[PDB]
């Protein structure tokens, strides 16, 4: 972690929360029961 | 060969004013 | 002028241990000009809070010091290696050594001669610490990114004037020659 | 910038006839023993004293003061001296001879108010600010009169950091500095949008929020009560500067202890 640009990163996702955590629940969860006719994962990164 | 040889807590050449041999001057 | 500046970060000399130039954040930056005031309301804020964030790790990183690269750290504030005082253990007994030698014939192909050992703890830091240049891992503490609340806003005295890489603080004077 | 004359020239009497008549402390039997002509070229200097000629060393003791206050560059004191000694050296006479004298015996004494110049910053921190002051609204704000609580508090800053807190006017604005480095320059004559929460219980621009937090250690029980924000924000400042001295402390033990690592579970 590099405190100085630690909310730069966050802010485009660079590091920090996944894509499971950074969105409203109802998305996540919605998205989640979708993923078989249209999928959504693959836009909405999750850093490492 | 041997030489030991004694005569050294240094040397005076006092001040005041300075050394001898001349430094210049024939 | 401005106010939530972009910080000013610092340059390094992997030679002498102060530091060296300065400049304001030359890449890491958003390109917001493809946004609306829905979010240059929040870049404006998230580089406030990086502000922020510099400005307390500056504070609570630094050592408190009067000039921003000081052309010669003190000895008292450079971090200096503190080493373990070394220990030999004196593998003999050097009168019973010698004593044998003269006596007898021995002639020595712990010890059988005499049960006697004794350390030698000596010191090992230094005489003289040291004096001039950190190092990397004190670079990184010293000068943290320096945030410029103002731009070059006074008389030619009163400007941050270690920022500028060909400064001589020694003479206050830009050098040459190039 | 006398004796730096002294110590630039001038290599006494009394010394002498109390050397070579053996009235020294130390080491009596010390001129007695010089070569026979020393000894008859050090009496008869203190049996009829030979004359000197001190302009040079006096000018010389006026040239070691402007270039330690600033006119004559230190590069210039090579045509300045000549310049100075070739006027003395036209006009010279008791008249000038003397008008020296006073002048080189008097700007190293006059020195109180240069001491002084950096002593309470009288130069460019309270002359500008008691100007700046004066360039405010009226002293009457509609709001509150936290105001003048404030105000004050930042004379005090002003007065009891010498370091530099120079206050520029830097046209039409004056700018408050935290230092020579300037690492901190907050705009004074952008707190007049402070003219506003003045009395009240997200509208500040850092730059005022800088200034919050540049003065905030020196406010006590003034800047009071829940006058809002601008209260509170000076007492919650405070004590993030109390917090702040805590983890800056608390980080200098965990890193002689032993990397982010601290900077985390500090900050």
Excluded at chain 3, 140 to 160: I, M, T
Excluded at chain 4, 133 to 153: H, K, M, W
Aim: glycine letters at 6%; charged letters at 15%; hydrophobic letters at 35%.
């Amino acid at each position: 972690a590099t405190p100085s640009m630690m909310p730069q990163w966050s802010y485009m996702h660079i590091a920090g929360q996944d894509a499971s955590e950074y969105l409203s629940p109802g998305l996540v969860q919605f998205a989640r029961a979708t993923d078989t006719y249209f999928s959504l994962g693959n836009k909405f990164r999750n850093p490492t | 060969p041997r030489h030991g040889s004694r005569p050294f807590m240094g040397t005076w050449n006092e001040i005041g004013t300075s050394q001898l041999n001349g430094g210049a001057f024939s | 002028s401005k106010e939530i500046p972009t910080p000013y970060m610092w340059s390094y000399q992997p030679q002498m241990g102060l530091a060296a130039g300065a400049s304001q954040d030359y890449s890491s930056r958003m390109n917001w000009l493809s946004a609306g005031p829905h979010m240059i309301g929040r870049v404006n804020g998230i580089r406030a809070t990086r502000n922020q964030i510099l400005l307390e790790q500056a504070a609570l990183t630094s050592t408190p010091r009067s000039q921003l690269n000081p052309p010669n750290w003190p000895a008292a504030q450079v971090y200096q290696e503190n080493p373990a005082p070394t220990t030999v253990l004196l593998p003999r007994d050097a009168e019973a050594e010698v004593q044998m030698t003269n006596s007898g014939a021995q002639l020595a192909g712990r010890s059988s001669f005499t049960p006697r050992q004794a350390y030698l703890t000596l010191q090992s830091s230094s005489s003289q610490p040291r004096s001039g240049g950190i190092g990397t891992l004190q670079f990184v503490e010293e000068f943290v990114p320096s945030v410029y609340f103002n731009p070059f806003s006074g008389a030619p005295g009163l400007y941050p004037d270690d920022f500028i890489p060909n400064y001589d603080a020694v003479s206050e004077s830009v050098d040459g020659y190039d | 910038p006398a004796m730096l004359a002294a110590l630039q020239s001038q290599p006494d009497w009394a010394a002498a006839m109390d050397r070579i008549l053996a009235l020294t402390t130390r080491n009596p039997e010390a001129f007695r023993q010089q070569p026979q002509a020393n000894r008859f070229s050090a009496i008869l200097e203190a049996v009829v004293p030979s004359r000197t000629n001190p302009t040079h060393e006096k000018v010389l003791a006026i040239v070691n003061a402007l270039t330690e206050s600033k006119a004559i560059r230190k590069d210039e004191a090579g045509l300045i001296y000549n310049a100075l000694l070739e006027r003395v050296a036209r006009y010279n006479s008791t008249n000038v001879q003397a008008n020296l004298d006073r002048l080189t015996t008097d700007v190293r004494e006059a020195v109180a108010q240069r001491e002084r110049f950096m002593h309470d910053t009288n130069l460019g921190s309270q002359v500008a600010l008691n100007a700046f002051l004066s360039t405010l609204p009226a002293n009457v704000p509609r709001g509150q009169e936290d105001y003048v609580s404030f105000i004050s508090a930042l004379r005090l800053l002003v007065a009891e950091v010498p370091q530099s807190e120079v206050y520029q006017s830097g046209p039409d604005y004056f700018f408050q500095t935290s230092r020579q480095g300037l690492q901190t320059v907050n705009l004074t004559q952008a707190f007049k949008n402070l003219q506003g929460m003045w009395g009240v219980r997200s509208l500040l621009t850092p730059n005022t929020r800088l200034l919050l937090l540049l003065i905030a250690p020196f406010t006590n029980s003034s800047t009071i009560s829940r006058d809002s924000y601008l209260g509170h924000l000076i007492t919650l400042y405070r004590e993030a500067i109390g917090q702040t001295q805590v983890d800056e402390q608390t980080f200098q033990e965990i890193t002689s202890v032993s990397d982010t690592g601290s900077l985390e579970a500090t900050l």
